Amino acid sequence: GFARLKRSLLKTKENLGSGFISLFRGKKIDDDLFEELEEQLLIADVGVETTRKIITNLTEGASRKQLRDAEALYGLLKEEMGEILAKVDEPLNVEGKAPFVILMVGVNGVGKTTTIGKLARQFEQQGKSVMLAAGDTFRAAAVEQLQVWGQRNNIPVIAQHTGADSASVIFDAIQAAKARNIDVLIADTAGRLQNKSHLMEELKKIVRVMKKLDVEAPHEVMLTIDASTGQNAVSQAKLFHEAVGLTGITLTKLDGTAKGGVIFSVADQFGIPIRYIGVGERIEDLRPFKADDFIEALFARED
Ligand SMILES: [K+]
Ligand SMILES: [K+]
C-alpha cells in the first residue's frame, strides 16, 4: 500500500522507518545501539530535542518490557514517531466564510509562491471563488509574477505600487473580496529575513488592520517551509510562530530529499497542524497531510 507516497519518500526511507531495519538486524539492545540510533535520527534532521525525547522514551520502554533484541525497537519507534505526526493531523477547513482569509507567511522561495497557486487552483476545483492579495509589496518582480499568474488562471489579484504598505494592500483586498462575494482570499506577505524585527512588526500590523473588517480574520495563518532545507525549516517555523500566531503549516519538497525527517521536528517542537505536504509538481501533489498514511509509507518495507 501507499506506493506513491513510498516513492516520494524513497530517499528518506534510507535512514528512517524501513531504514531502521538494517540498523537493528542482529543487534542487542545496549548503550551502543541507542548511540547509533541517535546519530541516525540526527543525520535525518529529526533535531536534537525531538531525538532526545524519542531515545528517552524508547530506552525506558525497552528496559521496562525487558526487550533483548534490537528488532523489537522497530515497532516501538513506529508507535512513538507515529504519535508525533498524529498530534498534528488536522486538515484545513475553509468553508463558510465571506471570505475565508489565509495569511501566507514564510521566507521567500519557490515553496510559498507555488503553494499559493496550487491552493487557489484546488479551491476553485472545489467550487470556490478565490482572490489573491500581493502583500509582498517591495519585491516588484514577485508582485508581477503573481499578477501574471492571476491573469493566466483568471483569478483576481489585488496589488498596489512598489513599496506600498502591505497592511493596506491586504485591507483593500479583504474589502474587494467581501464586495465581490469571494469565498477564499489568500494573502501573500514579505519573507525577507535580513531584518527580523521589521518583518515581524509588519506581520503584526497586517493582522491588526484586518480586524476592522472582520474580527475573525485571518482565519488561517499558514507557514510554508521547505523540507529540503533541513533545520532551517525549524528555525523559520520558530521565528514566525513567536511573532505571529501560526495555525497551519505546509511542508514542501518532501519528494526526492533525504531530509524528510524534519517533519518530526516541526511536529514535535511546535504542535501546529500540518495542513498539506508537497510530494510532487502537480497541483494535486500538494496533498492534505494524513499522519497514518505517512507513517505507514515510511515504515512499511513492502511496496
Ligand atoms: K513546491
Ligand atoms: K499577463
Curated annotation (Swiss-Prot):
GO terms for biological process: protein targeting; SRP-dependent cotranslational protein targeting to membrane; stringent response. The keyword Iron does not apply. GO terms for molecular function: ATP hydrolysis activity; GTP binding; GTPase activity; protein homodimerization activity; signal recognition particle binding. Conformation of the Ffh-FtsY complex and regulation of its GTPase activity are modulated by the 4.5S RNA. Formation of the FfH-FtsY complex leads to a mutual stimulation of both GTPases. It catalyses: GTP + H2O = GDP + phosphate + H(+). It is an enzyme of class 3 (hydrolase). Proteolytically cleaved. The cleavage may regulate function and subcellular location of FtsY. Full-length FtsY is found primarily associated with the membrane, while cleaved protein is predominantly present in the cytoplasm. It is a peripheral membrane protein. One of its GO terms (cellular component) is cytosol. The keyword Lyase does not apply. It is found in: Cell inner membrane; Cytoplasm. It comes from the Bacteria. Its EC number is 3.6.5.4. Disruption phenotype: Deletion affects both cell morphology and protein export. Mutants are defective in the insertion into the cytoplasmic membrane of three topologically distinct membrane proteins, MalF, AcrB and FtsQ. Belongs to the GTP-binding SRP family. FtsY subfamily. Involved in targeting and insertion of nascent membrane proteins into the cytoplasmic membrane. Acts as a receptor for the complex formed by the signal recognition particle (SRP) and the ribosome-nascent chain (RNC). Interaction with SRP-RNC leads to the transfer of the RNC complex to the Sec translocase for insertion into the membrane, the hydrolysis of GTP by both Ffh and FtsY, and the dissociation of the SRP-FtsY complex into the individual components. This is Signal recognition particle receptor FtsY. The lineage of its organism: Bacteria, Pseudomonadati, Pseudomonadota, Gammaproteobacteria, Enterobacterales. The chain holds residues 196 to 497 of 497 of the full protein.
